Amino acid sequence: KEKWGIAHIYSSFNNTIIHITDITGAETISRWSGGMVVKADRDEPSPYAAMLAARRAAEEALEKGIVGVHIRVRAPGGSKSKTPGPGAQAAIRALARAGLKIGRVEDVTPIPHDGTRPKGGRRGRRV
Amino acid sequence: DKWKLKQWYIIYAPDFFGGVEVGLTPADDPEKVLNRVVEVTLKDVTGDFTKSHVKLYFQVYDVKGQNAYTKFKGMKLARSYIRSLVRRK
Amino acid sequence: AKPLNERFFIPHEIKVMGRWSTEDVEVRDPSLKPYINLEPRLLPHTHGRHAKKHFGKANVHIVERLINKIMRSGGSHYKVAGHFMRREHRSLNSKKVKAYEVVKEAFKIIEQRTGKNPIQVLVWAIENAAPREDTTSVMFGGIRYHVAVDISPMRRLDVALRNIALGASAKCYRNKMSFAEALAEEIILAANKDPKSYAYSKKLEIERIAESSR
Amino acid sequence: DEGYPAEVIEIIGRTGTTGDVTQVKVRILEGRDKGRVIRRNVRGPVRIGDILILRETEREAREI
Numbered sequence: 001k002e003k004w005g006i007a008h009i010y011s012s013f014n015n016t017i018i019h020i021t022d023i024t025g026a027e028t029i030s031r032w033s034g035g036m037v038v039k040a041d042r043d044e045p046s047p048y049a050a051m052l053a054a055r056r057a058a059e060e061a062l063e064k065g066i067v068g069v070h071i072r073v074r075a076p077g078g079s080k081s082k083t084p085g086p087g088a089q090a091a092i093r094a095l096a097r098a099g100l101k102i103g104r105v106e107d108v109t110p111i112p113h114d115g116t117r118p119k120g121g122r123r124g125r126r127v
Numbered sequence: 128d129k130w131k132l133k134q135w136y137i138i139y140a141p142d143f144f145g146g147v148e149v150g151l152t153p154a155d156d157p158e159k160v161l162n163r164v165v166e167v168t169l170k171d172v173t174g175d176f177t178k179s180h181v182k183l184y185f186q187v188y189d190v191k192g193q194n195a196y197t198k199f200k201g202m203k204l205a206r207s208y209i210r211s212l213v214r215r216k
Numbered sequence: 217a218k219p220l221n222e223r224f225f226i227p228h229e230i231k232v233m234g235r236w237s238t239e240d241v242e243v244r245d246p247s248l249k250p251y252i253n254l255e256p257r258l259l260p261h262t263h264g265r266h267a268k269k270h271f272g273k274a275n276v277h278i279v280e281r282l283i284n285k286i287m288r289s290g291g292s293h294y295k296v297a298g299h300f301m302r303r304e305h306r307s308l309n310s311k312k313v314k315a316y317e318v319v320k321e322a323f324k325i326i327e328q329r330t331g332k333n334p335i336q337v338l339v340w341a342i343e344n345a346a347p348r349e350d351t352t353s354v355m356f357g358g359i360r361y362h363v364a365v366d367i368s369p370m371r372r373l374d375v376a377l378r379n380i381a382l383g384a385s386a387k388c389y390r391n392k393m394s395f396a397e398a399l400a401e402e403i404i405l406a407a408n409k410d411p412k413s414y415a416y417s418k419k420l421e422i423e424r425i426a427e428s429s430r
Numbered sequence: 431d432e433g434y435p436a437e438v439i440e441i442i443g444r445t446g447t448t449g450d451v452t453q454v455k456v457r458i459l460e461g462r463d464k465g466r467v468i469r470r471n472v473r474g475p476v477r478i479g480d481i482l483i484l485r486e487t488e489r490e491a492r493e494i
Contacts, residue, residue, distance in 0.1 A: 004150060023138070023150035024163035047489070048430060064130065090489075097488075104168070107206070246435045246459075247481045271477060348433055348483045350473050353447040360447050363471070366482045371474025423485075430489070 004103065005029060005061065007069040007095055011088035012076050014041075016050040018057045018091055020069065030060035034087070050087025051094040058098035068101035077110035079118035084109070129155070136160055139196045140185060144172055149185065149197075157190045164200065180205040230256045232279055232335060233320055236327075241336045245343050247369045252339065253277050261312065271370070278338065279319065285377045286399070287315040290385035297386040297414070321396035326403055341406035345379055345415035346372040349426035364430035376415060380406060383414025433483035434461040436468075438476060442494055445471060452476050453491055456484070463487045 006025055010017040020030040032053040034044035043049055061069070071092055075084045084107075096102045133153040140149050149167050154160040164186045170179040181204060185197035227234025238254040251274050260280035266272035273281070287308050290301030308314050323334040330337055350367050353360045367375075380402055387398035405413035411420070436456035445451050452472045458464060459481070468490045472482065 002151075022152050024152050024160075024165045026159075026163045027133070027153050051488070245483075247483050250481075271475065349485055352451055352471075352473055354445060354451065354471075355447045365451055365471040365473045366484060368472055368474030368476045368482070369480060370476075374474075427485075 002068065003066045004068040004070065005066045006072055007057075007100075008072045008074065009084075009088055009091050010074050010076075011045075011050075011084035011086075011091075013045055013081065013085050015044040016053065016085060016087035016091060018050070018054050018095075020057050020061045020066065029064050029066060030057040032057040032060075045085050045087055047087045047090035050091040054091040054094035055098050058095050058100050062099055066100070068103055069095060070103040071095070071105040072108050073105070074107070075109040078112060079116050082109055082111065134193070136190065136193050136195045138165055138185070138187065139194060140167075140172060141197055141199050144183075144199070146196075147172065152195070160187055160195050161190055163187050163195075165197065180208040227258060230258050232257060232260065232277070233323070234258060236323070236333060236335055238335055241333060241339055243339055243343070245346070248343065248346060248373060250274070251369045251373055252342070254335075261316075273370070278342075279335070281373075281377055282338065282380075283312065283315045283319050285381040286318060286384070286395075287312060288381065288385075290382065290389065296382045297389075299386075299389070301385055301389055318396045318399065322399040322403070325396060325400040329400070329404060337407050338403055341380065341403045341413075341415070342373065342376045344409050345406045345413070345419050346376040347419045347422045347426075348372070349423055349430075351426050351429040362429050364426040376419075379415035379418050386414060431485065433485050434463075434487055435459045435481045435483055436487070438472075438478060438480045438482065439467070441476070441478070442469070445494055453494060456482060458484075458487050461487065 005020055005022050008017075008019045008021065008025075010019070015034050017031070017033040019028070019032075021028050034046070034049035034053055035041075037052045037056070038044055038046070038049045073084055073088050073092070075082050092102075092105070132155050134155070135151045135153050136157070137148060138150045138152055140147050149171070150165055152160055152163060152165075164184055167183050167185065168179055169181040169183060170176060172183060181202065183199070184201045184203075186200045187195045188198045189196050225234060231237040238256070241254055243249045243252050243254075253274065253276055255277065257277045257279075260277045260283060262276060262280060266276050287310070289303045289307040289309055290296065292300075292302060308318075326334040326337050347367055349364055351362055352365050353362055355361075380399075383402040383406075384395065384399035387393060387402060388395040393401075402413055402415065406415045409416060411417055436458045438454045438456050440455045442453040442455070445453050450473065453469065454472055454476060455467055455469050457467050466487070468487060470482070470484065471491045
């Protein structure tokens with residue numbers, strides 16, 4: 001009789017998304033992102049915005065009855081960056097603090113086995 | 128509010144894994160929970176503390192009035208465990 | 217004008233200005249308590265002697281600090297209330313006797329209006345006007361970032377006193393109101409947390425900016 | 431609000447664009463984080479034994 005779900009965190013260099021679903025992941029419970037909390041695009045990937053979005057999502061999950069969550073951190077992966085953005089550990093800490101028990105913590109970034117060609121050309125970004 | 132229309136079903140592991148409880152899932156219609164996949168660990172399924180890196184995937188195949196039983200679909204090893212196993216030299 | 221017994225006042229006990237005692241003055245802010253000096257002192261005039269030593273201002277009486285902050289012009293390179301206050305030949309710069317008289321009259325007005333200890337009212341005003349957080353730029357990588365930082369008690373007290381002095385100057389600038397009356401009104405408003413006080417308004421603005429930055 | 435006082439116990443070093451901020455380690459005097467030692471940036475002159483009124487005890491300042 002324990003309510004355990006899964007908290008998927010999408011962390012990038014432009015935004016952070018916190019999405020709380022059931023144990024099977026087929027039932028959305030709460031979904032919050034930085035852009036729905038902060039007013040500026042530059043502030044979207046900030047750890048403060050991640051913490052606020054995580055707090056709102058945790059409050060919604062607690063209201064709906066979820067008491068524990070399994071963390072699933074994810075960078076964009078694929079041909080894009082494979083490292084999580086700044087607002088991932090902050091979101092995890094906010095989830096732990098807001099009143100949700102924390103279970104397994106794993107990284108589920110999609111790692112290609114020599115997949116598609118990344119964008120930017122053979123010379124990359126030249127800034 | 129569609130949330131008040133959702134009922135909670137209890138997910139049951141396959142018979143050869145002991146048939147123990149693994150979680151609860153909300154659903155409006157019982158057919159919508161007839162194909163969901165849940166990921167668990169052998170540590171939770173059996174109680175072995177050493178084998179916490181093994182992940183089992185159970186897919187629901189039957190609903191019997193708030194009791195959704197599952198079948199075995201796949202087993203995987205933890206990515207961190209594999210990365211620790213693989214090294215240079 | 218002034219009574220002779222006041223023009224030739226002769227104190228007999230060690231107390232601030234010979235009229236008010238700090239024994240009953242209480243500071244309930246743990247951060248600012250060790251840095252507000254309330255030791256028994258009659259004349260608040262140390263002739264400097266504290267600028268040389270690091271953290272030397274922690275041993276200077278709060279009344280003398282207020283007198284020193286008042287002893288100024290009001291504004292030279294910044295704008296207070298949207299105006300410059302460049303008083304060159306008619307400022308209180310290096311006029312400690314004039315600053316002392318102004319502070320004494322302001323304390324008398326505060327005592328008459330409130331009914332409590334003027335030093336206690338000043339302590340309340342400083343506590344209610346001391347900000348707790350600020351913002352600053354930190355250079356990491358190759359560019360800067362604005363982040364929120366805490367404020368040391370020393371800077372808190374300094375900012376509170378400077379803001380009170382600036383508010384008094386603005387209230388007394390080019391109006392029928394005198395400097396002592398303006399200072400008394402500013403101190404009373406800051407103690408009562410009224411937003412019209414310049415120090416309290418500046419504290420609220422700084423805290424809001426810090427909250428936005430963090 | 432009233433913040434939470436915390437006592438400074440050790441100083442890391444100087445930090446900032448113009449080097450006007452100081453990083454210290456503080457111990458929460460009271461609140462939900464009783465006894466926890468965290469690290470924060472400070473503006474203004476600071477010395478061991480000072481008390482800072484943190485508006486919150488959540489984000490710890492990173493390494494130098």
